[PDB]
Design a protein around this ligand. Structure first.
Ligand code: SF4
Lengths: 261, 1140, 261, 261
DNA sequence: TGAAAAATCTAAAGCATCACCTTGCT
DNA sequence: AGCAAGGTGATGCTTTAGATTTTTT
């Protein structure tokens, strides 16, 4: 039997809003360390993960290790029920296809319950390696969303160059080409607004661009995003909350193949 | 001038020599002969003045075998119209200015069809002018036409010429219009000499047709693999041809392996071909042998299958490479329209008839399917890919293939298209090959020119399409049409006579069909059987029987009973509507000229007000906007359209390009000046049919219906005589009655085709008798009949489907048929159909034209009013089953898709499931062919669905198990997609398609040789290894899997964009998800969605219903039923809230 | 001739946009008792009965009963052309085709004059009897609108059950099912937030829900609404426009079919 | 090698977004006096003049006259990257077919360097005539936007009546007819919402209102709007870009002279 | 492999419709 | 701190020419 109680239920809605356009049904697993979502997207190009650990939830009660497959196309739209302050009770039974939800407003009068129908899932698990990344940058998520949305209309790919001066983005297309420069600011008292770097060697990479536009919908989840990358590795983008945990994406780079040669 | 004349004389002399060498001797002696017309060709002859003169050469064959050819000169002419008071001055000027060019000119009083007040007997004095040659006709027509166009646009002596007629009429057509010389008739030809013209007269005493010499030929070539046979790089390897049931076959010894002996091909006992084989060493000797044998046999009919585009040109190219040209030795040339025709023998290919008059589904026009359908046997199957290999391993199979194709084309000529085309062209005044080529619209136009020359009227010009005409409120119409009827499936599922259906009926219609039963039977007996109702014995008995049946059905209006699947099809509805309502192309009249005649009296019963529904798309700009954008357009000069000239003045460019430019320049203005760009208005118009119009159209259609009826009667009588003849087993009378039976069957088939073509002719763009009004009126009257039938059967049963021609509809206790005993000795029993009769009296009350006026006598202009209604329904029996599938699209683009099974268990009809020859997987075709025969198993509805889902279960089990129990060769024969490349790969540019992808894979696989010439054939599968890339980009070819292993490994490394996989088998890299998706879509179309729309659980659990099903089932067909306020709440009453 | 004066003009705009969505054919009826609307939709499922009495308006005079056949297919837009708190005057002429509308800004500067044309339409009239009520549930309008929009995504049919514990609104469909239970208020004194219930017998019944979605376009019209149902009686939804007027929505019920018996 | 930098960047976005949907191909006249932009639509009806004088720029550097062929869709989509109150800069080369745009964040951290290609453009010049107008009115832009959006669906063309009593916005169509009257406002202490009328003789003009809807799109650019018109004179809709420039929309009045079919 | 021959397809262009949170601000 | 509302992204139903799904091998 599986019981969960959450009072900041808006973050789950933000998660489903961010992931509603990318994957149509994903995999969840529940353990004594919490809930994990480590899944491949529909086009089989890159890895996404939610880490909703045990003490992040307000009340957690799990009996055994389990895994379930929940379609996002129904649960994302039924989580549109809440506003910004409602609290959520979640139950997953042992051998029942129905998954139960209870929905309480903070007025201590309003109570709701819903039932979900589940389906089987057969998705291969891809191993999780921990590799060092040469360039780590930590910048506020608002400017990340703005820069991705503003390079969204240039072309279909983006070029990232991490150098001793700072970080540069670039894009090209029929209407034109444009690059963006971000330096480092170290005279601000807010860590959420501060950008910071650590570098080992300059990094040059090329990546998908509309797909980053698709994953820049998690901006209201966290105010700060950390990007880690190096040569010939997937780029890691993570949003970490001061209280809640981290949302992480591994993105594989472009093929970079010479069609003529 | 002189050079063209000498070239024309040289061509005439060459055609005369070629005609002479094949037996058609020019008649140069004074005497009388009899003959049978086989062809007619516009030529040039010489007369006693030794000048230019056009003529027609008629070729006749006699019954003894001999053949001849006669030439008759007739000066072609056309008509001009001039304003009154100056006719003679225009005639004198036109004579004195075209000096030596016009033969004679004279004023002919001829009856206009569109003239105002023309029914009293007003006639317009036209001017006929005639010329010596067709070229003179063309030149004078081109010189007069600018003056006519200028005069007809603004509203010297060329301003007096106001209108001009009969210019697109061909020359041999003009001769057959005038002298009534149709082919396939017997004639006396009397040739006195060069002074008196030849005399040709029809002979109706002889009816029996002779047998012309006919040659059916086919070739098999040498084919480069995966490439279409090119003319310049290949050669014929064998040719097979039948002459009058005798086979001949010539093989190229430099290509074949061992000699083949004389042998017989017999697919059915009625098809006998004995083939004797010549074996020429080289390809030149093969061409020489074929040319020499054709010259020795001298055939007047040469027939093939798709020869004009494949068989004929290839042989011409190979003859021209090897020196001896084909035109000088046989007579064939490309002419002008890509048509290989000879001046001495009719060339026919069966493909034109298969496309037009065979009524075969699209995709079954190939000779294999057409010979399976018509001739009844399937020819031998041999794919062309491994056909070049048969020139070495054994040539016996290739010889069998070639002789089989020759037998198929020969007997498809002789059994079907020969009597059809030579009975169709006794009516249409064209040439036999000309009848075969063009569409039914031109045949119907030629026929109406016969009937309109017989009525002494003048022929309206072809409908020149007006560019962007302004509608009545001023907007510019970029689309204008009529709201034609469509097909719609009112219920999807299986409907079998064994499985009970739920019927919800109202008893108000049962009162409608209770006191009117006596009138039903009286009307059904009065004119439908032409039996007076006094000499019957059990009239009261059958009336009380119908009362008892409808009273037993009365008390239970909602029941569960077995269906009776009926097809209420109206018997050629559209000609019947035209006959009933007297719809003529000049009958639709408007008050501006309807009031100008002398029969618009008060109380006159002459008008008919009939409604139709019009559909227009137009720009939202007024008259002032279009005038002002024209004034802005005329302030600047047009840019040069092509770089071979300067900028264009206003009289320089043509109408269509300036119309397109005006359309674009108004569209990009109204894009930002108005909210909508294209306003679509579907309105309800009403037009007046003039019921006392000159009746040539209506009595042509009625005479053709009557002649079809009488030829059907004669066909039945001669079929009975043929049955008696084959019972007794004589020799001469059997062949005589067989000839008569095929003659009458061909004649009634031709009449049926023409009757079907009358409706299609009027809506044709550019038709002389063009009428959008008729198209709208006939479609609205047909839709009204289908709608009122929908209400009548919808109240007493369930209408399964509404077609454009009839209703597929449905109780077990409902009256079906009844027999009446009659004292008449000729018809002791009369069988009547109650479902037919109730619809008959419904259309008798509704659509009977009680004001049908015919001119009884032309002396006092007396018109008799009569009540005529020839629109009748037909009941196509209680069919055993009908299966309707479900589609995502609802509207006017829905396709007529269903499957109806006869009571004996065969396939009665099947529409919409046209399997594509190469554009579909073999899996889909075999699944459909199994599921349709699988519907008829089981007892109840759930057993039907659980037994028809076994096909889907079997194929999902095959594809889910990775085809682990499947041999490899059939796995490629089933999975692979065949596809072609119509034109050059590089000419497309950089556009994405799966054919483009596999063509590029083949090009980089083995050189540019596969792209050097067009017509590439590509067989491909779709792989799964490059995840993320689109469906097009994963199209690996199939030539890789038979190549040497190293290049296969290299290109599977390259194409899958991976360099780490181990297994390279076909099961490992195959994209099974795509095949599951498409097979599941086919299952959803046929098995799953109809089972969902019938309150039945899913028979295949592996296929899930789409989301639009899960919303449509809730919003339309729910297990519950939504209530209404008026049922559960009080009603105050009905009041009319008028304006205060 | 008829005159209507309204000081603050938000409520007439709100009632007209409430009548926009479900009604295409309407018939205004003016008499000595005020203005009335008894309209049946073209889908023949629901009904509306709206009434603003005599004393609600500031200046009002009615000579006799007059019927005007307006067409709410495209009619509320001309009232949507106005401000929020503007003074609204209606002027109905005896036999002319023009209904005059006068709009006055609060600063007595921006005036506006509009005219309404009339034409001929046919309507079925249904008289409303008065009968012993049974199931009354008084709620805030915002909560009812939010719960109706909530259940709109679940299905097209709604289950209404009144019982001893309280009231329950439910829906079901291919996506699943959802129930929401509300009990009576105990320790709250503010009138616009509390709910109350009047009951005679616990009732389980079903209605349609798309028509309830069309009913809930009166959220800022009033802070109070009541739902009223009974066995085999159409569900009526009552909005009380302040101390100014009232509005009834009638919806046909939905019961099981005893085809076998 | 044109170089201009301005401390405000929102006004360029406002001007360009106002010019976005109306014109597609534009010829930017560049000189020492400032930036001129006179052009027309593809419909050859709406004319636009746009003057940005050099005294309003922060830093300015000009070489000589320049002919420019920018399609406005390109930068109209590019300048979504500019912030609320960022530093704007435009840079042009002496003989290149590209333009560079430089955006500076106010905290000197986010630096955006875009550039774009070009196309040769031909434009028939049409200089305006200088003549004395009769009806010149100064109105708030927000109320003008409100009344144009109100009248947009009322009809198709508007009739403007100007007299000493004020202005009248009349329209007639399938929904009826209606007029909005605005009088003089003299008793006011502030100017930015003070309507004022200046008159020579009363006039009666007619205008197509789709072009007024296109002209309305410059609402956030300025707080006031000046309409200048006379008999057989194009409407002049003037907005004042700060104290530095002005944008005039010239509209040919729609005469709709029907010939009686 | 060329083809309009020829009328049935059909796929890219077309155009109407739904949808919610983002630019000013009550 | 959410409204006016719409606007560009998606989605569903016409449409109209020629390539293609059609012949021949
Ligand atoms: S319908 Fe009557 S009035 Fe009209 S054209 Fe014919 S005869 Fe004349």
């Amino acid at each position: 039997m599986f019981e969960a109680r959450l009072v900041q239920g808006s973050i789950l809605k933000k998660v489903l809003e961010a992931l509603k356009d990318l994957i149509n049904e994903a995999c969840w697993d529940i353990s004594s360390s919490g809930v994990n979502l480590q899944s491949m997207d529909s086009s089989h190009v890159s890895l996404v993960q939610l880490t909703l650990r045990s003490e992040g939830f307000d009340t957690y009660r799990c009996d055994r290790n389990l895994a379930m497959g929940v379609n996002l196309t129904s649960m994302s739209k039924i989580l549109k029920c809440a506003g910004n302050e409602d609290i959520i009770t979640l139950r997953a039974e042992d051998n029942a296809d129905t998954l139960a939800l209870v929905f309480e407003a903070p007025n201590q009068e309003k109570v709701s319950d819903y039932e979900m129908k589940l389906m089987d899932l057969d998705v291969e698990q891809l191993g999780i390696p921990e590799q060092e990344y040469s360039c780590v940058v930590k910048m506020p998520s608002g400017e990340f969303a703005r820069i991705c949305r503003d390079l969204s209309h240039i072309g279909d790919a983006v070029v990232i160059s991490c150098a001793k001066d700072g970080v540069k983005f670039s894009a090209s297309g029929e209407l034109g080409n444009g690059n963006i420069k971000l330096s480092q600011t170290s005279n601000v008292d807010k860590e959420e607004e501060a950008v910071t770097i650590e570098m080992n060697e300059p990094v040059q990479l090329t990546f998908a661009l509309r797909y980053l536009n698709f994953f820049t919908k998690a901006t209201p989840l966290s105010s700060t995003v950390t990007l880690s990358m190096s040569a010939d590795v997937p780029l890691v983008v993570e949003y970490k909350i001061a209280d809640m945990g981290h949302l992480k994406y591994y993105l594989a780079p472009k093929i970079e193949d010479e069609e003529g040669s | 001038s002189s050079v063209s004349a000498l070239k024309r004389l040289e061509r005439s002399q060459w055609t005369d020599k070629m005609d002479l060498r094949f037996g058609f001797e020019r008649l140069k002696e004074p005497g009388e002969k009899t003959g049978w017309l086989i062809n007619m060709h516009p030529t040039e002859i010489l007369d006693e003045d030794k000048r230019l003169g056009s003529a027609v050469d008629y070729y006749f064959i006699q019954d003894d075998g001999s053949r001849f050819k006669v030439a008759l000169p007739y000066k072609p002419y056309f008509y001009i119209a001039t304003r009154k008071g100056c006719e003679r001055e225009v005639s004198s000027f036109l004579s004195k200015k075209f000096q030596g060019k016009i033969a004679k000119v004279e004023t002919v009083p001829k009856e206009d069809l569109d003239l105002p007040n023309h029914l009293v007997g007003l006639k317009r004095n036209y001017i006929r002018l005639s010329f010596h040659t067709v070229e003179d006709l063309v030149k004078v027509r081109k010189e007069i036409s600018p003056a006519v166009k200028k005069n007809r646009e603004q509203d010297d002596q060329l301003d007096n010429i106001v209108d001009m007629r009969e210019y697109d009429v061909p020359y041999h057509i003009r001769l057959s219009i005038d002298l009534k010389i149709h082919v396939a008739h017997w004639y006396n030809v009397r040739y006195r000499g060069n002074a008196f013209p030849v005399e040709i007269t029809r002979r109706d005493d002889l009816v029996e047709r002779p047998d012309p010499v006919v040659l059916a030929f086919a070739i098999a070539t040498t084919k480069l693999p995966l490439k279409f046979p090119d003319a310049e790089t290949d050669q014929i390897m064998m040719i097979s041809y039948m002459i009058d049931g005798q086979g001949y076959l010539i093989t190229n010894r430099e290509i074949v392996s061992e000699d083949i002996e004389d042998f017989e091909f017999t697919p059915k006992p009625e098809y006998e071909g004995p083939f004797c084989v010549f074996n020429e060493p080289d390809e030149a000797h093969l061409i020489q042998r074929w040319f020499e044998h054709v010259q020795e046999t001298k055939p007047t009919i040469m027939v093939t299958y798709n020869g004009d585009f494949f068989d004929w040109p290839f042989v011409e190219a190979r003859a021209a490479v090897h020196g001896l040209s084909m035109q000088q030795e046989i007579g064939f040339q490309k002419d002008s329209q890509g048509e290989y025709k000879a001046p001495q023998c009719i060339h026919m290919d069966c493909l034109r008839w298969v496309k037009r008059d065979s009524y075969l589904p699209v995709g079954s026009h190939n000779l294999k399917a057409a010979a399976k359908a018509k001739l009844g046997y399937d020819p031998v199957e041999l794919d062309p890919e491994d056909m070049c290999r048969m020139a070495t391993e054994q040539p016996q199979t290739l010889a069998t293939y070639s002789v089989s194709d020759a037998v198929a084309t020969y007997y498809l000529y002789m059994k079907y298209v020969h009597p059809f085309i030579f009975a169709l062209c006794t009516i249409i005044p064209m040439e036999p090959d000309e009848v075969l080529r063009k569409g039914s619209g031109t045949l119907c136009e030629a026929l109406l020119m016969v009937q309109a020359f017989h009525a002494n009227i003048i022929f309206p010009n072809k409908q020149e399409q007006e560019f962007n005409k302004l509608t009545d409120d001023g907007h510019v119409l970029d689309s204008e049409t009529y709201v034609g009827g469509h097909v719609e499936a009112l219920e999807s599922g299986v409907f079998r006579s064994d499985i009970p259906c739920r019927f919800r009926m109202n008893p108000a219609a049962f009162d409608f069909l209770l006191q009117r039963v006596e009138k039903t039977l009286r009307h059904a007996l009065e004119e439908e059987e032409k039996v007076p109702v006094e000499q019957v014995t059990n009239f009261e008995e059958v009336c009380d029987e119908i009362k008892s049946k409808l009273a037993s059905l009365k008390d239970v209006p909602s029941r569960i009973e077995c269906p009776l699947i009926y097809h209420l099809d109206v018997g050629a509805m559209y000609p019947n509507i035209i006959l009933t309502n007297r719809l003529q192309p000049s009958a639709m009249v408007d008050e501006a000229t309807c009031a100008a005649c002398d029969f618009n009296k008060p109380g006159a019963n002459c008008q008919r007000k009939m409604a139709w529904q019009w559909r227009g798309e137009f720009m939202p700009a007024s008259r002032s906007e279009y005038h002002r954008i024209q004034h802005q357009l005329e302030s600047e000069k047009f840019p040069p359209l092509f770089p071979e000239g300067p900028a264009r003045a206003f009289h320089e460019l043509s109408r269509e390009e300036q119309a397109k430019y005006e359309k674009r320049r108004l569209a990009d203005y109204c894009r930002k000046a108005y909210k909508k760009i294209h306003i679509t208005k579907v309105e309800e118009r009403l037009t007046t049919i003039c019921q006392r119009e000159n009746s040539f159209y209506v009595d042509t259609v009625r005479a053709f219906r009557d002649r079809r009826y009488e030829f059907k009667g004669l066909h039945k009588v001669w079929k009975k005589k043929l049955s008696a003849a084959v019972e007794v087993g004589d020799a001469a009378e059997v062949k005589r009655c067989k000839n008569m039976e095929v003659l009458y069957d061909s004649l009634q088939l031709a009449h049926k085709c023409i009757l079907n073509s009358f409706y299609g002719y009027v809506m044709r763009k550019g038709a002389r008798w063009y009428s959008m009004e008729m198209a709208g009126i006939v479609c609205f009257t047909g839709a009204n009949i289908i709608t009122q039938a929908r209400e009548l059967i919808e109240q007493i049963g369930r209408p399964l489907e509404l077609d454009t021609d009839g209703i597929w509809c449905v109780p077990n206790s409902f009256p079906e048929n009844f027999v009446f005993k009659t004292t008449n000795v000729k018809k002791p029993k009369v069988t009547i159909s109650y479902p037919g009769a109730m619809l008959n009296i419904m259309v008798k009350e509704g659509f009977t034209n009680d004001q049908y006026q015919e001119l009884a006598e032309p002396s006092s202009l007396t018109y008799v009013t009569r009540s005529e209604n020839s629109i009748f329904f037909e009941v196509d029996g209680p069919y055993l089953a009908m299966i309707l599938p479900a589609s995502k699209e609802e509207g006017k683009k829905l396709k007529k898709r269903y499957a109806v099974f006869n009571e004996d268990g065969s396939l009665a009809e099947l529409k919409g499931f046209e399997v594509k020859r190469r554009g579909e997987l073999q899996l889909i075709k075999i699944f459909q062919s199994s599921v349709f025969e699988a519907f008829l198993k089981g007892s109840t509805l759930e057993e039907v669905y659980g037994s028809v889902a076994k096909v889907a279960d079997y194929w999902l089990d095959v594809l889910y198990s990775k085809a682990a129990n499947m041999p490899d060769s059939e796995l490629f024969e089933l999975i692979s997609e065949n596809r072609s490349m119509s034109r050059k790969l590089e000419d497309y540019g950089e556009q994405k398609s799966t054919s483009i992808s596999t063509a590029k894979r083949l090009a980089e696989f083995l050189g540019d040789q596969m792209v050097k010439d067009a017509g590439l054939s590509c067989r491909y599968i779709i792989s799964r290894k490059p995840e993320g890339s689109p469906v097009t980009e994963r199209a690996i070819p199939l030539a890789i899997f038979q190549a040497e292993p190293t290049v296969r490994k290299h290109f599977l490394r390259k194409w899958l964009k991976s360099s780490s996989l181990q297994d390279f088998d076909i099961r490992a890299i195959l994209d099974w998800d795509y095949y599951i998706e498409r097979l599941g879509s086919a299952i959803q179309k046929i098995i799953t969605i109809p089972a969902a729309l019938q309150q039945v659980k899913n028979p295949v659990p592996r296929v899930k219903h789409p989301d639009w099903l899960h919303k449509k089932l809730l919003e339309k067909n729910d297990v519950y039923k939504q209530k209404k306020i008026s049922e559960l709440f009080t009603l105050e009453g009905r009041r009319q809230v008028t304006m205060a």
